Amino acid sequence: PIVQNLQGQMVHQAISPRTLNAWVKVVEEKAFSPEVIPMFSALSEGATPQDLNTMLNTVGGHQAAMQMLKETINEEAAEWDRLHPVHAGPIAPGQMREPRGSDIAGTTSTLQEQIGWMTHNPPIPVGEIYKRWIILGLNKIVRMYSPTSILDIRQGPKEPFRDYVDRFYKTLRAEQASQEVKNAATETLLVQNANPDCKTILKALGPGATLEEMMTACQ
Amino acid sequence: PIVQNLQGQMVHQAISPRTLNAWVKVVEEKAFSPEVIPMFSALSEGATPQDLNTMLNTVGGHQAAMQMLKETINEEAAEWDRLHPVHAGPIAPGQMREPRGSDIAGTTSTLQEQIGWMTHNPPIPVGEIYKRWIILGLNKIVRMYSPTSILDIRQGPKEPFRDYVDRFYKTLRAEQASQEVKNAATETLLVQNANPDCKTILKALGPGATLEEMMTACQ
Amino acid sequence: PIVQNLQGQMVHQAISPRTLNAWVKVVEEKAFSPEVIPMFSALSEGATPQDLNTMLNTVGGHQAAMQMLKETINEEAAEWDRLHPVHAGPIAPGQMREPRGSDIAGTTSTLQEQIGWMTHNPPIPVGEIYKRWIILGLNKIVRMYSPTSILDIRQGPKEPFRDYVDRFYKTLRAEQASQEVKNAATETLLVQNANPDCKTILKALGPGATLEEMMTACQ
Amino acid sequence: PIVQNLQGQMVHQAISPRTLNAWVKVVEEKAFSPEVIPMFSALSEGATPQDLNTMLNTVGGHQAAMQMLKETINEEAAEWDRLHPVHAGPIAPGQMREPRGSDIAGTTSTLQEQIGWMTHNPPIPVGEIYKRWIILGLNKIVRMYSPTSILDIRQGPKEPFRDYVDRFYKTLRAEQASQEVKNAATETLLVQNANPDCKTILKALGPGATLEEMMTACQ
Amino acid sequence: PIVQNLQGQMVHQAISPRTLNAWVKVVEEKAFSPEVIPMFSALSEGATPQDLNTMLNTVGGHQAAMQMLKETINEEAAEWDRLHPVHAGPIAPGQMREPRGSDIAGTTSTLQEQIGWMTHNPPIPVGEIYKRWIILGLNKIVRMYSPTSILDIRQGPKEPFRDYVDRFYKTLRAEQASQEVKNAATETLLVQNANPDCKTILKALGPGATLEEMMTACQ
Amino acid sequence: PIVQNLQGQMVHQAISPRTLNAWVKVVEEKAFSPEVIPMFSALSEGATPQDLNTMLNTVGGHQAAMQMLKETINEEAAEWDRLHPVHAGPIAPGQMREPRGSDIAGTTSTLQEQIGWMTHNPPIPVGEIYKRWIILGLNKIVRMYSPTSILDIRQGPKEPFRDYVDRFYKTLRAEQASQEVKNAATETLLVQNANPDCKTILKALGPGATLEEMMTACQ
């Protein structure tokens, strides 16, 4: 990653192997569950494209997911290129070539080029743009690690409301439900897909009770 | 988090992944038991709103609890807004917009805005105010990984007074009994919910014996 | 804790979560055995009252012991107040209010107030005074995690003298026997509470043999 | 490795034993699987030839692979020599001898010579050239179980398409299939080596569906 | 411990809890085996008396050994006092009181006094002198965790010479045999306490063969 | 070890306990296997003689090996002395006594003397010369757990060529075969000590096939 040195300049530093191993950790337990996303972001602050690739390259297994991820990245790359036409003419000292989609993604760019862009004035944040494309990939992949389908989340005959709740919101994340959607689902589906006794209690509570009030009424 | 640099200025630094992993640790063993609270605080000294979110976002599972937490945070946000009316007019260089509830919580604010507030003179401590709202959430959630049946805590027929005591105060924490309440409960309920032999001894000790004297009289 | 920065000033730094986890470690294995005491001290050098509380608050379990500890702390607080009458009148810039027992203990004092005291010239070392009160608590608690009836430490019929010795001095620590007491106990009780064969050998050695000579005579 | 000091000069620093142990780690679990490659690179940024050898020398086991690696390195060395004829004449102060293949590889060069080259103006990046040769070795070794054995990757009778996909691309990596090849294999072999039901669905999808569409059609 | 800062001055730093835990580690597995000695030394470079005590105080168990250790320390203290008479008269600014045995050992001295001595010009290395006394204690204690018994180390009927050798020198360490003694024992006892076939071979080798030649002759 | 400070001078620094523990690690798992050698070297860059001893002294167990190591070190010491006669006469300020074998090894030399030599102009690298002698010891010791009989490495009747290869080169390392020797052994012994079917195939391949071609022909 790029980081701030003593003299105020942003300079490059090697990715930490501790962080790569932490990333390996997460993927090894949680696979590509909704939480792999904020983690991947948290673990890659200030990363270059090379650093992002190094991280993705330590993933073992998940061959289909890696390919799906690659394909989103490549769709984002081709779009970048469409929306950014090349401007001709000679490059001045101190300046650099306009990055193509491939360069952002780190296929056609050197580490030095990546730092020059991310550190130029004004910078072109290739690491940030490429990490955006990777997160969009991750979004698509998580939807294979937690396939949507909320209508199939029903409270068991003797299942504690608490557990039914974890299974409800755990499914909403996977399908990347916005906070707005979760509010509507709570007022409706959560109530409806509950067991008979609870559904009567919840239905009795009135529309607009908070989640902590619902859990209390059906403990 | 924000921290003190050599030149005396408070500047930003990335959350440690070691701390995030430590936080993941705690939640993975203790779940949301009373101790998750002081820990969460201890692990987030000087945090920004982005840092607090990054931490909450590494929690896997507990979908119902996360939603309940979100809802408290949002109630605190809406209150903030109610008690802080917006003051119109142009923003001077060096100053910044008055934060809304959403900005405190980090939904509508950038990292730079968060640092400007927390580091301005006088600062507006968004990280502190948002961490307050999160701790209030945690309080509510622990009461789903904790029951308040102080009346149901009775000393077993052959249970050592020592163990009966851990089970008594362990229940008081969960229900967040102030230190004042604990004093009254010790003088009363602790004595009353004890086994026959001990209750006679304790009742014999007189009102006002310390906890170490009680344990001694019933060892 | 408070620590020395480059410019020579003592400034605050967040408690290390590594240290808190180390402290959790100790309590999780050794509970409140005599060794929990020097450890707690070693782990809290330069701590503020907030840091000391954060540490005590990560302890899980031991509800009776925590309450007993709280009560000593509060007795020490009330004494502090008795021996330190409040002096009236307005506070000058650069000065601060005289700490009460509650402030030392961190209930009524802010982190900033704690640093001002501990860092003022001359300082008022609230962290040191409060850590003293906590160690006195620990002393009382260890006497529920240990023994106290040295008279009950007898050498087994076929127990090696070496093991009998560890069990003898391990009990003396818990009961905080001074070095002077240990010398008298060695000359007497150690000899007397030994098995028949050893007791004759030790009694044969004469009063005044060293511990290494005793172990040699009964190997 | 060589790194940037405060005064701007690139100076030498000892390889971290933490990194060597991390490298030992990887090899001990993943052996020489496709991921050992980007890791080895990530762990050796800025390394000298001595640092690269130190790393290879901590590998236990894999005697055949180490020898195969040595042989590629030596073929690369002999080629270097072929393409770089020696230029005679006396060496000026401040300059150094032209490195031979053996020197790059670190057999005939001292640590000081390695730093002089890598740090000279213009530098001769022996550490970079030697790390290139090692990665080419690694490529050959990872194939210690290739094909083209893709024809043997068939979807099980009741195997989930997802798993069949990981096994397909996991085999493509080992055989170092370029991104171009993977695209053709996806359109063809992936479809053909799938179970009966899936193969009909995929064949129904039409040539040119993305990997995420294929997984969706056969979930 | 005391360590060298940037400005060249030796200043104090808190003992690392990582080191204390490492020390706890060693004692928890190896107890007080001959190797506890060089370790204790290695772990306490530059320590003050307070640091040495903090380390000894984290030892759990071994009550008899701790007391024996204390007694050696106290014998060394009383000797120090005998050989160093007190010199009267007022203390100049910048100077300090002559340390007594008790001060060296850290019972009667403050941390600041310890640093003043160890850092004065010329210094009085209390940490070094006290660590010497502790190592002498350790020596005595190890002789209860491995006392002695050489004549009892005989090579088994079908025991490999290699193993017989580890058991021979492992016993010599415990009994703290100097390097001079080990040489004589090798020429004699090692040969004599070997099995019949080996003893004839060794006896055949002639007096003065090295240990590697002996192992070769009896593999 | 000795290291480069900011002002350009080589000054001393305490051995890292992390490195000593890493060294303990290696010896505790791999014992004295061929890989202990490059590790020991990698872990001791820039070490003084005291640092090398501190490292050797943390080894537990292996009493016979430690003695054998000591004896090589002492043979190297006595040789040093033979080849370096003492030159008489008074020592000038700024200069130092010519080191004897014992001083190199750290028995008769102080830490300060070691630094003066290693840091003098021109230096006398006692740490380097002593580490050479230790590596020669290690070489001899590694031959205690392994066998120097390559003629005894034959491919099993149904043993996979791959495994036969690991057992061949694993034996070559132990006996420290140079890279030149390994090339000759591959062309000859590897082929000859293979099972009947493989030996015919290999013999069929012609002299001069690479190791990867041999493995392919006998998979």
PDB file of C-alpha atoms in Angstrom, chain E residues 35 38-39 165-166 169-170 211-212, chain F residues 54 57-60 62-64 68:
ATOM      1  CA  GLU E  35      17.968 -24.815  30.436  1.00  0.00           C
ATOM      2  CA  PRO E  38      20.429 -19.477  30.171  1.00  0.00           C
ATOM      3  CA  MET E  39      16.923 -18.577  29.251  1.00  0.00           C
ATOM      4  CA  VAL E 165      24.789 -39.973  24.977  1.00  0.00           C
ATOM      5  CA  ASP E 166      21.843 -37.551  25.343  1.00  0.00           C
ATOM      6  CA  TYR E 169      25.174 -35.135  29.027  1.00  0.00           C
ATOM      7  CA  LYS E 170      21.632 -34.244  29.984  1.00  0.00           C
ATOM      8  CA  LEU E 211      32.677 -37.728  20.655  1.00  0.00           C
ATOM      9  CA  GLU E 212      31.879 -37.921  16.919  1.00  0.00           C
TER      10      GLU E 212
ATOM     11  CA  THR F  54      23.092 -16.931  23.733  1.00  0.00           C
ATOM     12  CA  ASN F  57      22.464 -21.718  25.009  1.00  0.00           C
ATOM     13  CA  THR F  58      18.675 -21.652  24.569  1.00  0.00           C
ATOM     14  CA  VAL F  59      18.749 -25.142  23.075  1.00  0.00           C
ATOM     15  CA  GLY F  60      17.174 -27.672  25.522  1.00  0.00           C
ATOM     16  CA  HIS F  62      20.426 -32.682  22.570  1.00  0.00           C
ATOM     17  CA  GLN F  63      23.227 -32.978  25.109  1.00  0.00           C
ATOM     18  CA  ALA F  64      25.421 -35.171  22.880  1.00  0.00           C
ATOM     19  CA  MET F  68      29.997 -32.535  19.663  1.00  0.00           C
TER      20      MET F  68
END
